């Protein structure tokens, strides 16, 4: 999908901790490459009291009656690459509720 191509195009954001090491003084030796591999979107759900509850599908009728937004959990697989590959870290981070379009591939209808 277009969004995964977009995140494949943003690439990396590199930062060097000023790798002290005591080339090791102008080649640092402190590479940190941060990127985003995947981006996932989930259909609207609401769990109350937090987690320990049974989840229910959230419908547009609910968002209208409640006079609230119709949000889907936005998740994105964060890639935390250390020393250009010395250490790879994956994390699925939840980025709050992205409003989903009705009758789209992300609305229950």
């Amino acid at each position: 999908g277009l969004l995964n191509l977009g995140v494949k195009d943003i690439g990396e954001k590199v930062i060097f901790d000023g790798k002290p090491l005591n080339s090791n003084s102008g080649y640092l030796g402190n590479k940190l490459s941060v990127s985003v591999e995947q981006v996932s979107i989930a259909k609207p759900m609401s769990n109350d009291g937090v987690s320990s509850a049974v989840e229910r599908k959230v419908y547009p009728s609910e968002s209208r009656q409640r006079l609230t937004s119709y949000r889907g959990k936005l998740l994105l697989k964060l890639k935390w690459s250390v020393n250009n590959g010395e250490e790879n870290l994956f994390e699925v981070r939840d980025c709050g509720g992205l409003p989903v379009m009705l009758q789209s591939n992300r609305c229950h209808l």
């Binding site: 995947q38 996932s40 989930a42 259909k43 320990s52 049974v54 989840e55 998740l75 697989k77 699925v92």
Partner: protein, 349 residues
């Protein structure tokens, strides 16, 4: 004799633990040296956790950590380490019950207790429950369906059931119960009854629910949720290809509602089971367009729109099988599935 549904009468067992650990950190320490409540939490902080399974089984082939150190145990050397931790166990041994004094003096000699803590508890509610948990297990060990169901149904109405054997004998009794229910329903009720989408491991003394057989929704798979999907694909297979259908789609959309977080998030059968449901959806469509060129003499029947719908799928399923391998798979014998899929493609020609 079998595993009981309840938090273990927390009375003497909790102070026996104190004395066990406190001795192990004392004796352990003076070893750690001669090689130069909290104390139970510190014991677990001194050797990590077991993760998502049972026994930190991991290979047998990589690092040859050459372990020799000649044995290093001169009866004389053990009693140098031990002579001081035992006198420091006394001070708290005094403050402990006469039963826990010798319980400690037994395990510090290396004797093990033939007195199962679950063979003494004296509580009304409890003890019955031991009778029911044992009756049900003796009734499935002879397949008594009509009686195992009654004991199971009473066992959960009594206040002492943590999914436990309820999810592991509650599906076994509904497969053996030729009558009402598809472990499935019960399996899908469980899935919603402990998604535990929260990544909780380690920290506190899990001694109320150890069993990687209830828990998860963090990382550590749930095995009733994996069994729900496996039982669901086997429930789709029976009498397909032998609008009220949907099931093989219901399972494509119920596994998609996931698409990693905890399950997608973690790899394997999640991906693999999905592809397997997807691979079955490819056959069924080759059958429904197979026998003697589709059904028979040709198709003329506009293009083969049906071949293109199937080749799209076959190409997709090879993507799901590949990402399941790449991400460290643990169960797909790729050679056989690729040969089956190519020979099955031959049918589509």
């Amino acid at each position: 004799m079998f595993e009981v549904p309840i938090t273990l009468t927390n009375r003497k067992f909790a102070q026996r633990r104190k004395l066990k650990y406190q001795y192990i950190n004392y004796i352990s320490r003076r070893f750690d040296r001669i090689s130069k409540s909290d104390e139970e939490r510190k014991f677990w902080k001194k050797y990590e956790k077991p993760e998502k399974s049972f026994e930190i089984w991991r290979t047998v082939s990589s690092q040859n950590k050459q372990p020799i150190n000649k044995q290093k145990m001169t009866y004389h050397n053990f009693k140098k380490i031990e002579k001081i931790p035992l006198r420091k166990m006394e001070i708290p041994l005094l403050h402990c019950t006469k039963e826990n004094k010798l319980y400690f003096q037994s395990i510090s000699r290396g004797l093990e207790p033939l007195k199962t803590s679950t063979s003494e508890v004296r509580n009304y509610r409890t003890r019955h429950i031991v009778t029911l948990t044992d009756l049900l297990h003796l009734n499935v060990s002879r397949h008594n369906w009509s009686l195992a169901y009654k004991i199971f149904a009473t066992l959960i109405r009594i206040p002492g059931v943590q999914i436990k054997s309820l999810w592991g004998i509650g599906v076994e009794i509904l497969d053996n119960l030729s009558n009402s229910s598809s472990g499935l329903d019960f399996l899908q009720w469980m899935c919603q009854i402990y998604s535990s989408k929260s990544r909780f491991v380690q920290n506190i003394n899990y001694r109320s629910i150890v069993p990687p057989f209830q828990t998860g929704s963090r990382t550590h798979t749930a095995k009733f949720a994996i069994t729900y999907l496996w039982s669901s694909l086997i429930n789709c297979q029976k009498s397909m290809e032998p609008t009220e259908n949907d099931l093989l789609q219901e399972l494509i959309d119920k596994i998609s509602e996931w698409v990693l977080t905890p399950p997608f998030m973690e790899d394997a059968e999640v991906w693999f089971i999905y592809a397997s449901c997807h691979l079955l959806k490819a056959d069924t469509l080759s059958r429904q367009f197979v026998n003697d060129n589709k059904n028979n003499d040709l198709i003329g029947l506009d293009r083969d729109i049906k071949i293109n719908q199937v080749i799209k799928h076959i190409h997709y399923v090879r993507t799901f099988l590949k990402i399941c391998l790449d991400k460290g798979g643990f169960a797909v014998p790729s050679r056989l599935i690729e040969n089956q899929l190519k020979s099955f493609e031959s049918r589509l020609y």
